[PDB]
A and B are shown apart, each in its own frame.
Chain A
Amino acid sequence: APKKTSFGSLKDEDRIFTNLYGRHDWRLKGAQSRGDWYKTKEILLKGPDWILGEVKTSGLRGRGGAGFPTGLKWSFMNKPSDGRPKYLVVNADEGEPGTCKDREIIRHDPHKLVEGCLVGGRAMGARAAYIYIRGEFYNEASNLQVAIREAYEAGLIGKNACGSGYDFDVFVVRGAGAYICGEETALIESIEGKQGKPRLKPPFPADVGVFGCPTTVANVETVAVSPTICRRGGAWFASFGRERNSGTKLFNISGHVNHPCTVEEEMSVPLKELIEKHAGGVIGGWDNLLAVIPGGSSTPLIPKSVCETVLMDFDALVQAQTGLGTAAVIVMDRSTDIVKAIARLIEFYKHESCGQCTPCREGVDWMNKVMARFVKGDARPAEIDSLWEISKQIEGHTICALGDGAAWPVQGLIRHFRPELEERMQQFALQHQ
């Protein structure tokens, strides 16, 4: 029975992050026990073209949140050298509210990330790898440094990594509390000692990146799966999920659920099945569900009527007008002030804007003020359409995608809970004459 049409239950043998909960030693010995750093020399001696082909045929899409096809992106950096060095920059900022996957990947099995850095650098012909870890993740960064030291002493990286005759270094760079530094160009600017302000594209990082050198920015989850994909092949990974939604994924379920947790599951698993299987179900029963944010704060919220059959992949969630993003599930029950949560998200985005460009810098603060007034109910119903137009103006007119991540949540709120805003304004008007 080819072309599976029902997904959502893969057993442990098909899981990549077998030490997700940190129940086994994360020191190099546990990684070797679990198959980490195995036959890396033979893969390294297969050449960069073979690794790029495996990543392409595996259909893997970027786990940062954009879902860009990883094979094409990594092959963008496959040009002959012109004198400048080449670098791989692994993104570990993890600033999206609701997201905790990269933290666990870094702290509980960092050797997967180190080997992914090695194989990605070989594929991209990168001289060294820079891992930009969130500054608040001090212990995680220290564990990553311990794993890096173990790899350096074991000869897995550095001069003549394994026996491939390939030289490769890994460096860990810590930020200082800035969500905007997760954006690839803002991350590059932060590495070079500047403010975390995104730069315009073109040029793309593959042509003018860190230190003006060709580089590729990749999420830690994307990097950490490439070694196992090489070992088990592109086809094994491409079997899971639907077409163009291949592979497995880490899911964070938080909010109003009985047992919030982080699990690994096949991509196209239905949202209801994931919630009631791994999170123990919505608090107070599935009939107590009000809304669910599927992929972090930047994705629009969907009502309960859509979470009955929607699948957890890029395409289905895009058809649901909500996006997959980082697969961070935030669950809000019927006891939740839906206006308050969206207003808090807009306040977060107002506090995280870098200020560089006019639409974000001004309109996000404007939306924050408008939403703060909406929470109380001081406004008039015409201000709802006004806010819709403000969000429309901001979206697509900013340097980076933070304007999108600020505009989309209010667009979803206005789309799906307009009567609540209207009745709140009515109650305030009748109370205050």
Chain B
Amino acid sequence: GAGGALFVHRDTPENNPDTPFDFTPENYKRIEAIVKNYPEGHKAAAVLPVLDLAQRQNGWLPISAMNKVAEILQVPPMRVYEVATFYTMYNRKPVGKYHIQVCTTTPCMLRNSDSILEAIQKKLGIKVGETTPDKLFTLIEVECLGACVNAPMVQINDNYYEDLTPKDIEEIIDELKAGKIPKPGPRSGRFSCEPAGGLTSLTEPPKGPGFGVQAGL
């Protein structure tokens, strides 16, 4: 439906050009490595990875971070604003310690993803746009995560938790807020995109290097 996030920036005491932001020296070395991956006349190509690195170091992207990236890469700030607003993995607002994203697309939706959404909502007490008052959990709806075979699937802090049932996501939230790291992947004894039972293919051992190499080679 509606987006809910505005694409106009208004200065705030918590988000203004004079908000403190700066890369760490290690991040500066990483930026150098990122920039050295492109032809010498095209350094604007590094806008996306450097912006992502700024987000990874800071957690989100204040306007000061965008201005810093624009200054580092000698790119006009409007281009960095364009990139930051176009791509949905960029957080122009603070988020929780764990960003819970649940796919609501048709393949995921067919296999009861509403159960996962309601389980998360009931366990955390927040809706699909809000944040936990502890400021450690955030819940949103995403499109398709490319893991349709395992459904419903939830991605948290760049990790995939698949083959979910309400109990599975509930215990995932419990052990995440308990300071533990839940095992990413499915939770049905499947651990891949294989059939749930039988292994209907690739049962014979794979063969060696020169199995069917043609002649004259």
Is any CB of A less than 8 Å from a CB of B in the complex?
yes
Stretch at the interface among B8-16, B36-44, B121-129, B167-175: B36-44
Q: Which residues of B contact A24 (CB under 8 A)?
A: 206
B158 within 8 A of A: yes
Question: Which of B106, B151, B159, B192 sits near A297, CB closer than 8 Å?
Answer: B106
Contact at B89–A176, with CB atoms within 8 Å?
A: yes
In the complex, the answer to whether A20 meets B105 with C-beta atoms within 8 Å is no
Instruction: Determine, out of A36-44, A114-122, A147-155, the stretch whose residues face the partner at the interface.
Output: A36-44
Q: What string of 1s and 0s marks CB contacts (under 8 Å) between B50-93 and chain A?
A: 01100000000000000000000001000100110011111000
Q: Which residues of B contact A177 (CB under 8 A)?
A: 87-89, 142
Closest to A196 in B: B86
Contact among B46, B158, B196, B198 with A136 in the assembled complex (CB-CB below 8 Å): B158
Chain A residues whose CB sits within 8 angstroms of the CB of B159 once the complex forms: 138-139
Pair B144/A95 contact, Cβ less than 8 Å: yes
Which chain B positions have C-beta within 8 A of A98?
Answer: 107, 144, 148
Interface residues on chain A, number (Cβ under 8 Å): 87
- Which among A134, A136, A236 is the interface contact of B212 at CB below 8 angstroms? A236
Smallest beta-carbon distance A88→chain B, Å: 15
Look across to chain B and name the residue whose beta carbon is closest to the beta carbon of A335.
B110
Q: Mark B148-159, 1 if CB is under 8 A from A, else 0.
A: 111100010011
- In the bound complex, residues from chain A placing their C-beta under 8 Å from that of B109 are 341, 344
B168-217 residues with Cβ-Cβ distance < 8 A to A are 184, 192-204, 206-214, 217
Assess whether B48 is in contact with A176, with CB atoms less than 8 Å apart. Answer: yes
A211 at the interface (CB under 8 A from B): yes
Known: A134-B146, A171-B37. A12 touches B202 (CB 8 A): yes
Across the two chains, which residue of chain A brings its CB closest to B43? A193
Which among A254-262, A387-395, A412-420 touches the partner chain? A254-262
The distance from the CB of B200 to the nearest CB of chain A, in whole angstroms, is 5
CB distance B111 to A193 under 8 Å?
no
Is B119 engaged at the interface, CB distance under 8 Å to the other chain?
no
What is the bound-complex CA distance between A21 and B191, given in angstroms? 9
* CB-based A-B contact count at 8 angstroms: 220
Tell me the smallest distance from the CB of A352 to a CB of chain B, in Å.
7
**Contact A193:B44 (CB < 8 A) given known A177-B89, A211-B39, A236-B212:** yes
Contact A176 B52 (CB under 8 A): yes
Stretch at the interface among A99-107, A199-207, A316-324, A373-381: A99-107
Cα distance, A100 to B49, chains bound together (Å): 24
**B217 touching A348, Cβ below 8 Å:** no
In this complex, what residue of B is CB-closest to A19?
A: B206
Secondary structure of the B contact surface, majority rule: loop
Q: Is B143 on the interface with A (CB-CB < 8 A)?
A: yes
Q: Say yes or no for A309: interface residue by CB 8 A criterion.
A: no
Q: Is the CB–CB distance between A352 and B143 below 8 Å?
A: yes
A112 contacts chain B at the CB level, 8 A cutoff: no
Given A34-B206, A95-B146: A278 in contact with B195 (beta carbons within 8 A): yes
Chain B residues with Cβ below 8 Å from A20 are 193, 202
Q: Is B95 an interface residue (CB 8 A)?
A: no
**Bound form: Cα–Cα A174–B50 in Å:** 11
Chain A 325-353 interface mask (CB, 8 Å, partner B; 1/0): 00010101000100001001101100110
Which B121-145 residues have C-beta < 8 A from chain A? 142-145
> Are A99 and B89 closer than 8 Å at their CB atoms?
no
Known contacts A193-B44, A231-B213, A254-B107, A99 near B148 by CB under 8 Å: yes
Between A and B, 12 residue pairs with Cβ closer than 8 Å are A12-B204, A22-B192, A23-B202, A38-B210, A85-B39, A231-B217, A236-B212, A253-B149, A260-B196, A277-B200, A278-B201, A354-B86
The 10 closest A-B pairs by CB, nearest first: A176-B87, A176-B89, A177-B89, A193-B47, A193-B44, A177-B88, A38-B209, A138-B158, A18-B206, A97-B144
Residues of A with Cβ closer than 8 Å to B?
A: 11-13, 15, 18-24, 32-35, 38-39, 42-43, 46, 85, 94-100, 102-104, 108, 134-139, 171, 173-179, 190-196, 211, 231-233, 236, 252-256, 258-264, 277-280, 297, 328, 330, 332, 336, 341, 344-345, 347-348, 351-352, 354
Known: A35-B209, A192-B45, A344-B104. 17 other contacts (CB 8 A): A12-B203, A13-B211, A21-B193, A33-B206, A135-B89, A136-B158, A139-B184, A176-B87, A176-B90, A177-B142, A179-B144, A196-B87, A233-B214, A254-B148, A254-B151, A336-B110, A344-B109
